């Protein structure tokens, strides 16, 4: 039954600009497409219908066309509450199937992430487990790699990522990465080191500390 | 105001057993029909079931017949979504809809109550400060922090100096660990001066498991 195609899966641009978007699917449904707008928390609400209709309330530079396999939502121009993921979905025929999303993204100018280590508290150590953070904060554009070096030696697998969403003041992103061992493997070793690669700044960046008995 | 709040969502074990509410109000329920949907965690939607007015036929989705049954009081106005033998992939939240004019497109929506289908048992988290061994400078902004590790289920507030400091913060989105239990940090970013007479503490609150705690960040 009829996958639906949404390309790209994201899209950064600035406000102000006009956005379009594309919504595919595998065969015809001719007009039964309708268009979902999903502000990050909050519940989906119904943007355009019948692939041409605005629903009430929805403002005048959201705009539904094509017809037949291939279609598009555009946003005239672009305002801070435009930045949101947008769905679409067949009903021309059964069972009921959504595309799989675009994220509109704010373009931004380029931007210098501060990195901080943060040292496993002793209250952790005793429980027999250890937490380093690295804090990559306040940045753009989201790609970004952090690499953990123990004793100058290379890490994989003990460690998960995370990060905000653009932030409503400075449109920019923050970043966790988090190292897990446990107090026997931690305490037997000595220079625990953050290396953060990224656009933003000259060569890679490497903040440290060591146990220091 | 058209209304739709549903209700009866938290933590189940598989192959438990969920009832399901949507509670419609600002209109004439007894004239539409109505869905469930559901998106994953973090993923896209899916169709679940619906109904039409009276109640007389229903109609669900391959990965949720004989299991999930749609139902309806018209006299209290409030949809009913019951769930049987609930897979882990059952996980999600769940919206009701109702559907607009004369075919299938969904032209009103309810906020959601989130489905969390598990083995693993509530846990209140434990909370761990964010101090920088970072003893120096004059380095310009200055860092510090909330480890929130080990809780289950979702959701942990987190905020600071009881609601007094919002500036600079960054609560992170939680993260499902090997072990199978969520941890997020929350960190605070402000520029050295302020920090002479201000202080600095988390407020860590976990209603699943009554949990609120208040970590201060010793400074240095």
Redesign the interface.
Known sequence: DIQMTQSPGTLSLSPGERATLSCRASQSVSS?L?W?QQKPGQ????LI?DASNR?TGIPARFSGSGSGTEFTLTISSLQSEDFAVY?C?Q?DKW??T????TKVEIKRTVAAP?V????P?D??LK?GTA?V?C?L??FYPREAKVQWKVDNALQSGNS?????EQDSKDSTY?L?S?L?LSKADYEKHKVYACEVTHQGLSSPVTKS?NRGE | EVQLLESGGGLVQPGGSLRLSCAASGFTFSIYPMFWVRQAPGKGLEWVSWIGPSGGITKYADSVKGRFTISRDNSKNTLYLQMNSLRAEDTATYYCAREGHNDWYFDLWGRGTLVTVSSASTKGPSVFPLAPCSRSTSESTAALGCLVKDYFPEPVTVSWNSGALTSGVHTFPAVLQSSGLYSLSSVVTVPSSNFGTQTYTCNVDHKPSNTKVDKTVERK
């Open positions: 039964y309708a979902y519940a989906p609400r119904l219908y629903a769905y979905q009903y069972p009921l959504f595309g799989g999303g501060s901080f280590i943060f040292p508290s209250e952790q429980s937490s953070v804090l904060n306040n998960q990522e995370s990060v905000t923050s966790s988090t897990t500390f």
